[model samples]
Target chain A: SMKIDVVTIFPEYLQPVRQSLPGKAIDAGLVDVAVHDLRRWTHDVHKSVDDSPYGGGPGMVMKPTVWGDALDEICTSETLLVVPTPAGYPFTQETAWQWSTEDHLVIACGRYEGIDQRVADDAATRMRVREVSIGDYVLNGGEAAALVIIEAVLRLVPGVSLLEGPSYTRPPSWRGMDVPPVLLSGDHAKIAAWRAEQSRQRTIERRPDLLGFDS
Target chain B: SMKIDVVTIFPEYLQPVRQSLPGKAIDAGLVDVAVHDLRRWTHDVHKSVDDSPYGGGPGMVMKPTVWGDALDEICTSETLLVVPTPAGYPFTQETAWQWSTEDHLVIACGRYEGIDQRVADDAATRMRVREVSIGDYVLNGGEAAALVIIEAVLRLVPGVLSLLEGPSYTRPPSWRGMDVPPVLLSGDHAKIAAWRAEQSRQRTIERRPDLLGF
Candidate 1:
């Protein structure tokens, strides 16, 4: 089982993770997820973790000292650190699948302009660190991205049903659209062949990049 | 102001939006965000909205009828339809910027195997529709993606800081062997502005080459 820990100032942002598919994994004992309050590490009375950008910008940048303090208490040698930001590398299924095999996963959700770059640089000394982005767009914070990454990783955990192919149900003819007859033909071999063909065809049509067709 | 609506079976999945920066917008009346339950449109005892795929597969595919019904009741002529899916066009900052200008934005979150593709195709006839993907990875459902989109759009809303993102830093000019660039503290307005723009451009070049028109 993989032990996952998410460190963020907005712990409430993880409410979805506790209510969605990942929550089921936790109940079933397939994985363990814990959300830590990043503010707990602060020594100031106001517990401020952000300050004005030294370079002069519209938004505040998360202070390096707070991040440094948080990681010192949360990280261990076995943890795989994930930092989500637009400045990070693109996130993909291949990467999520790779991380699923780990024993421990630590996700640091950065807010404000961004986290101190030095935090990731220094954290890399003890554990594997990946600065990943969900897409090309910018979000208010990393909390949503952290949820995205965690859900992707949990779906690949052992015993979780991988729903990769097309599916159908009882009323095979819904709104006059009929299910391909091969599925109901009850021929095991033919059904397997049809599913494989459909899955591959859908992939080729929708995600050519997955097939190395990027232009 | 912008009006945003998210339709999902798991309404609780959107709790984050009610507490974050977007939530502040809602409280201040800068933006109005409403979460609707897709199950409300179903008349069945189970509030069933998904049926098995017409072919055959492991997970169920959401029925088109449910989506059509939900959208019919939620959307207006001026509404812009946003669908989050792995099979859709890639989403980016440009798309979010475009969406921020709409009068009404209705997001339909798909679950199970996926939503029937025809739902989006048919909806396009009534209003602008975009089937966008957040990234290359997949999620359990579109609720998370909707939150991601809503947050991005809220940032671009007029009067919301204009963020104009660039690298940033704070005091203790030096921290653990890492030193803040001297240009930031030089106090020369012209040089600082130039350096900030260059830093933004260089970061975009290194991380998102496509954004730089590469």
Candidate 2:
């Protein structure tokens, strides 16, 4: 079973996963998922996890003090620390595929000014670490990105199911959109060929990058 | 106020947003957020929202039947239909900025083949529609991507608090392998401000050259 830990201020973030694929994966005994409230590691009355920047810019920066101990205790050997941030290198299908084979994933959720650089640099000494961005655009926080990554990567787990392609449905004709005459032919071979060509053409148009095409 | 309607198979998928930014935006009276459970329209005991793909393929295909009726009721004249599919055109920061100015957003959540192609093509006749992908990877559903899009675009809403930058450190001045730079505490606000500006410029160029828009 793949063991995953999500460390975040919003412990409620991934609870909704129970209604999605990752939840089913957990139910099937294929994956072990845990959510850790970062504030649990706090020592003060307010349970502060962030403060102003040092060389100061905008927004509050998550403190190493909070992150350091949180990670130190939660991370074990072979744990892959996946930090989702705006500036992290973009995560692609390739990244998700590789993460499926990992022993464990500890995703630290912080996307704002950001967690202190030292938190990442220090963790690198003992375990594997990577900061990944889900997309080019910025979001309010990393929780959403964390969900996207978990959904993308965990579905690739050996026992979990994923990787579907193509679409189209309904009668021989629906509005200006017909269900493609080939589908109505009832010839399985011809139908298969058409579907293949359809997916290829559509992917080439809007998702050539996924096909490893440049430009 | 900006309006958002997130239609999904998992109603709880977006219910948690009440605890997130879009929730606050709704409470702050900046954005009106509504979530419609697609299963609500199901006329059967199974509450079916998906079916086997036509022409044969892996996984269920979301029928345009449910989607067509869903949008017909939810979408208004200026409602922007944003469908999140793995095969969609990539959504970037520029996409989010443009989306913010739109009068309404009705994000359709589906995947498993994906809401039938005709759903989008048909919707285009009445209102603006676009299929956008969040990243180069695929996910189990569209709610994750919807939250991403919602946050990215809604942050640009006037009166919604957003857009901050750079890293930070405090106290211990000597903790955890790095120190609080001396200038910040040197008591010269002008000197401190200058260093941060230079730091922001240098870091922006190195980490986010995309912001330069050249």
Candidate 3:
């Protein structure tokens, strides 16, 4: 079984996952997910996790003190610490495949301007830490990104059979477009070849970066 | 003002966005966002929106009939239709910026195997349609992706302060013996601008060399 813990200020943010594929995985004993409130680690009365910027910026930066104690308690030496941030490396399907192999995954969610850079710098000494971004654009916080990461990772888990590749149904000829004749040929080999070519063509057109054609 | 309409089966999936900046925009009357349930357009008792693939597939695909009526009711000729899919063109900051200029954006979220391809192909004949992928991986559905797109686009809206902001650091200039760069407080406009530019360049170089056309 794989263990994945999500630490975030918005604990309710994970609610959507409860109705998703990852939730099904958790129910079946294939994965163990724990949602921790970062504020729980704060000792202050207000339980504040962020403070004003030191050098005068627009938004508040997440404090390091709260993050340190929260991480120390939940993270073990073997835990793969994933931080979701726009500044981090882009998260991709390839990264998802790599992370699915981990025995334990701990995702640290940052809000406001972002978590104190030191939290990640300090955690790097004790565990495998990776700062990942879901895409080139920005998000409201790390919670949504964490949800995306978990869903992608969980689908790749062993025994989790997900429908992939192109799919078409019913009326082969719809509105001037026709399903390639190869699919209706009843030849399994031809269908496989057709699907492979379609997948490649789709990927190239949609994501040429995946094929190093971005330039 | 900007209008964003999110059409999805899991309308609750966007509950988190109600607490974020976009929600604040909606509350302040700076933006108008409507979360519509795809089932609202279904006339059937079960409100079924998906069915098994015709050629035999593992998971069911969203039906075009339901999506067709849904789009017909929500979208206008001026509406820019955005469909979220793993097989769609990659979505980026550039796409978000372009979308911000539109008067209306109708985001259609596809779940399960995916919406019938013709839903988009057909919708294209009526309005501007763009099928977008948030990233390289597959998502459980497009609700989350739609939320991501909204947040990104909201920041670019006129009167939004998102672009005015940059990296932030809080009080206690020194934390754990680390110090904020003195250049930030130097009070020299040229130095601050130059430092900010350098920081931006350095960040792009470190995180996304592709942006530099490398």
* Top TM-score model: 2
Q: Which portions of model 1 show Cα errors greater than 4 Å?
A: A16-18, A161-215, B16-18, B162-168, B188-214
Q: lDDT of model 2 at residue A123? A: 92
For residue B85, model 3's alpha carbon misses the true position, in angstroms, by: 1.2
After superposition, the stretches of candidate 2 with alpha carbons farther than 4 Å from their true spots are A161-166, A186-197, A207-215, B162-170, B180-214
DockQ of 2: 0.52
Q: Per-residue lDDT for B167 in model 3? A: 51
Which pairs clash in the backbone of model 3? A52-B170, A53-B169, A53-B170, A54-B169, A54-B170
lDDT per residue as tens, model 2, B82-188: 99987778898999999998889999999736887788888998999988888878788887888889989988898788122444566557776677678977878
Report clash pairs, candidate 1: A167-B53, A168-B52, A168-B53, A169-B52
Off by over 4 Å in 3: A43-46, A159-166, A173-178, B39-48, B51-58, B159-168, B181-206
Each candidate's lDDT (Cα)? 0.79, 0.81, 0.79
Interface RMSD of 2: 3.3
Ranking by TM-score: 2, 1, 3
Better of 1 and 2 by TM-score: 2
- Residue A91 Cα positional deviation in candidate 2, in Å, after optimal superposition: 1.3
- State the displacement of the C-alpha of residue B155, model 2, in Å, after optimal TM-score superposition: 1.9
Per-residue CA lDDT of model 3 for A1-215, tens digit only, reads: 99998998877656535555787888878899999988899898999999876555666789888888998999999999999888777798889999999999999988737787778878988999998889878776787788789888988899761124566665677767775677667787878777777778887766766677753
